[PDB]
Amino acid sequence: NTLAVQGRTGQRLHGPLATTFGPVLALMDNQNNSADMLNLQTYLTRVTQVRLRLQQIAGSSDPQAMMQMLAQTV
Amino acid sequence: NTLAVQGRTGQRLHGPLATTFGPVLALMDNQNNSADMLNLQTYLTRVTQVRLRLQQIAGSSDPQAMMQMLAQTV
């Protein structure tokens, strides 16, 4: 949001095409297959969803027995 | 709906972001991949769609056989 509001105050068009097509496009998702920021942001929560269950809520078996499984299947 | 209408009456913008980006966003589905409330609501109908057919309409065989083949594949 710092980049969003401090990039448009450069006058939308004459806001310079350096700091325009960079991280300003990736914030506003189009209703299509644009490489948004929300998708990497959701996949990050899925990775920390797996790992938090891996460490603490290893279900009375060791995390080691599942660590070997993950490093086998990657 | 209780949370929606009793959270908007806090004045949309000065309605506080504590009770805004929580369960008020998940109600209004966008036309995209937003994690809506409707998708957990549809999967929750599908799981009881399987189990209600499991218990009563076990088709003249026991539910125990299908319980075995269901807890096998999880």
- Nearest-Cα distance to chain A for B18, in Å, is 18
Q: Which residues of A touch B32 (CB under 8 A)?
A: 29, 31
Q: Does A31 touch chain B (CB under 8 A)?
A: yes
**Do the chains contact at A29 and B32, CB–CB below 8 Å?**
yes
Q: Does A29 touch chain B (CB under 8 A)?
A: yes
Q: Where are the beta strands (DSSP E) in A1-74?
A: none
Match 């209408």 to its residue by tokens: B5
Please tell me if residue A42 touches chain B, with a CB cutoff of 8 Å.
yes
CA-to-CA separations, B67 to A17, A45, B49, B53, B70, in angstroms, rounded: 61, 33, 15, 12, 5
Question: Hey, how many other C-beta atoms are within 10 angstroms of the C-beta on A62?
Answer: 9
Q: Which helix (H) or strand (E) holds A42?
A: helix A38-55
Measured CA to CA, the distance from residue A43 to residue A48 in angstroms comes to 9
Confirm if B26 and B38 have CB atoms less than 8 A apart: no
Cβ-defined contact of A31 to B31 (cutoff 8 Å): yes
Is residue B17 less than 8 Å (CB to CB) from chain A? no
User: Please, which residues have CB within 8 angstroms of residue B3's CB and are 6 or more apart in sequence?
Assistant: B19, B23, B24
